[model samples]
Target: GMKYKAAIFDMDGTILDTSADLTSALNYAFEQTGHRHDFTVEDIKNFFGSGVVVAVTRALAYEAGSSRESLVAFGTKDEQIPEAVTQTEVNRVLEVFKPYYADHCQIKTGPFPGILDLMKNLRQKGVKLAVVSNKPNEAVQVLVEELFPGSFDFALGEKSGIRRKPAPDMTSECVKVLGVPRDKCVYIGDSEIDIQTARNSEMDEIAVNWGFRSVPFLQKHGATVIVDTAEKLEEAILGE
Candidate 1:
């Protein structure tokens, strides 16, 4: 029998390469809003773990002369912003991004190579599976239903008035749904933020390098085991 009873995962950058669609949406919003953004897929790749709101704000921060610290704050907390950026501007971009992404997200989004096979193997081994993400709950539902139907026992995204990852709320909720103790579960993700989320929730963490961040980044964030390919990811999750 496996030591771990359950496996949890993050959506974007973990199992899926959403960079193509995310970048498309962001750049589309920029064009619609009259904002000048010259970032590439690689640049948008850095923003997935935090949520779309944070991703957008960070992208704007790179364009705005103000500090990234303030820009991130503006996104999450509606905090004060530099004179050049205002609530109206942020709202406009978000308004365009949300609907556009929801409709167009699937165009270029697909599972990472070997991920589907890996997940299926995990399920056949009697490991309960779930997906916990910072993406909005509605969008998360849409993606999982459309992309990996029946693959996960539980999947959740950020909801209004609820905290996202690095806070342990969503992870805790998943544990409750999976009917398992926290220690019996392992979380797999690709970003430093995912590492923090796993730590905050007191779960074992396995970082995958095939997604957004580099292997060194995942390692620097305290990942004990980093997997570079789907074969290694399956091995790590199964404790092989």
Candidate 2:
């Protein structure tokens, strides 16, 4: 085992290229739910760092003309959600998005370049692997088995009555399950939420540039070790 005993990853943007599939599901939900705006992949990319609820809500708010900061604040509870959308409507959209995504999640979803080899090499090195995502638990289970079967030691998505990422709950559970020390693990993700998750769990954070947030956005949030390519990530995570 290496100094970093376990490699914990965020699934959506960090490991998988899910924005296109996510955008399709989001746009379909919006149309079916009577939302006026049609969201593009770029439009939906900014909404992804958080969980599905926040991601969907941000899309709703953006379609309603809210600024990006307002979107972030709305997700964090510092401001009121736009009255243009109601809780009832949000829940309705969620209903439509879930099953739609479940079936279509793999339509265009896959790992970012070099991720497969990176995981394979890590597995070969006897390093444990895990995924912590905000996607529904069922979807998480299906996606991991489909995308990288037999590659992970622990794979979790959002489950009812369990805290999700950026709260340290999922991260802690993964560390415990992997039998890795808190300080001997590294968290790799593509969003501000991932950085916060690492902070909450007292682990080293590696921010990826290929995900939802922009480079400056990641740096402004105090990400010190950011890697843009999977080769760099291999070095960062595998101690190569």
Candidate 3:
């Protein structure tokens, strides 16, 4: 029997490995904006968990020569924008990035190994599955339909009115949509944002180390239950 009636997943690093496509779009944005810098998949990894706007802003900071440590220190808040990256510049980059990413998001993106099977088994066991991502809603809708059709009972991305992850807005909405009590649900994700989201939403969380963040990183973020393998994840979700 399943211990949780609902499993909400974070899309980018949790359900799908979207680093390559995101990197491509971000670099394309830089190209269009006349910046010559190219970001690697690894660089793009640290920029996610936050929404697209924050991700673009962080990339712009990097392009302006901000140290990785400094960027990390900047975190996701806009209170202290990096020195060289102005809000106007971030908006300009986003104007190009959003449309480009929507079209190319699925090009090099796919589920991590064993993820499909894990979802399938969870569905078979009658657990409602949902995805709440910080990615733009358009891209999230496209990818969910194309890549994992019929797998999720509900899937949502960053959209107007709902605050993005770590805010509990989206997670609260997912819980309502899934019709599951918060305590009967668990959020599965790969970043500190997920850890905070689950906490703020008053739900249990199962962090996955196979995603963007490392085990120590998740630990630093106060993640208490983390699983490294798909099998272990299934065990955690099912209380096996």
Give each model's clash number. 0, 0, 0
Q: Relative to the true structure, how large is the alpha-carbon lDDT of every model?
A: 0.82, 0.86, 0.87
**TM of each candidate vs. truth:** 0.91, 0.96, 0.95
- Per residue, candidate 2 scores C-alpha lDDT tens digits across 83-124 of 886777778998999989998999899988999999998888
Stretches of candidate 3 off by over 4 Å are 73-79
Stretches of model 2 off by over 4 angstroms after superposition: none
Tens-digit lDDT track of model 3 for 1-240: 458999999998888989999999989989998986578988998787788777877788777777665655454544466667877988898899999999898888999999999999999889999999999999999999998999999999999787888898888888888899998999999988898899999999999988888888889989999998888999899999
Candidate 2: residue 14 Cα off by (Å): 0.8
How well is each residue in 1-240 modelled by candidate 1, as lDDT tens digits?
786789999988888888888888888998899888566888777656787667776777667765544443443456565566555677789899988888888888898899899988998989999999988788889999998999999999988788878789999999988998888899999887788898999889998888887887677768888888988988888889
Q: Give the Cα-based TM-score of candidate 1 against the true structure.
A: 0.91
Given candidate 3, what's the lDDT at residue 99? 94
TM-score of 3: 0.95
Q: By the lDDT metric, which is better: model 1 or model 2?
A: 2
RMSD of 1: 2.7
